[PDB]
Fold this sequence. Notes:
Blueprint: E1 3-9, E2 17-23, E3 28-35, E4 41-43, E5 68-77, E6 85-96, E7 99-112, H1 114-117, E8 124-127, H2 144-148, E9 156-160, E10 167-171, E11 184-187, E12 196-204, E13 210-218, E14 225-227, H3 229-236, E15 243-245, E16 250-254, E17 262-266, E18 269-273, E19 279-282, E20 289-292, E21 294-296, E22 303-305, H4 307-310, E23 314-318, E24 324-328
Parallel strand pairs: 3-8, 4-7, 13-22, 14-21
Antiparallel strand pairs: 1-2, 1-10, 2-3, 2-6, 4-8, 5-6, 6-7, 9-10, 9-23, 11-24, 12-13, 12-17, 14-22, 15-16, 16-20, 17-18, 19-20, 23-24
Amino acid sequence: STGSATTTPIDSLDDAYITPVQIGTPAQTLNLDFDTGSSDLWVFSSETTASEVDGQTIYTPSKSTTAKLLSGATWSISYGDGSSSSGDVYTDTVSVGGLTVTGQAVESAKKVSSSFTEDSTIDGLLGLAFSTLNTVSPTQQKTFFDNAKASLDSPVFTADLGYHAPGTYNFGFIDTTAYTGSITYTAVSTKQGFWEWTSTGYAVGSGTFKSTSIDGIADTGTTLLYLPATVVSAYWAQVSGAKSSSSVGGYVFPCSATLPSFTFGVGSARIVIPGDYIDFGPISTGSSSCFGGIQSSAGIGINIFGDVALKAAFVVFNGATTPTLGFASK
Length: 330
């Protein structure tokens, strides 16, 4: 089997992407944030504290003939972006882009952080990191991808994110029309539960490539690119007027600036992030100071290849027994 679904930016900045997912029988379609940095499928539901719902589409297990309470199972979450949520667990039928999993753990929010309540466009998360990060207790649950692997033509999924435009998540096959040149594959460590790999270096604009190893994660659930302070300083030094602002919480730059590209290494290959991808617009309406899309990972404790980096590439998440990551230009 295979699946193929369109993913759409939630706003004009590409702050996140939502992908329609069918849950239950008859289908209930929720728009979920596909997150290769976490491993829970959780949704707003008929059980979510009413005051903490504001615009989201909710999952109602009692209207699904295939929903079953996973007795005793609970979940509780909080990722690297200041948010959280918790509740109980159902199993139900889940389909993505034509690909169907039966008995998928669907984690039903009794409570959500206000950060989610505030964003009406995201109905939940579909985790695509390794199942070892799944928060269900006392019986840990598998991700949608892990459950699907048995039936997939090939145990892979691909992320093809758009710049200010829709893109595609595919399951079980590699669309050879979706990229240019070759796919360069690189080793993955699953020791932290992430799609963790080592970039071979970087360049700023038309500058010379600096060979240097940068360990980080491929994380579709993170908006920006978070790299070591040395790297980030070298980038923003090339932008007249750019500065790190504690009031704003990162590098800002004059909205009148043209940003240089940023290149990262994948083995001997190179992925070029166009400068415009690094512009996240005025810090507040009307401001002439703009927020930068490359920021320091110092204090995160891990480098993050988020959407800024990933959308410049066709990315293969190879879930073979020895997992790997592939990157192609597109």
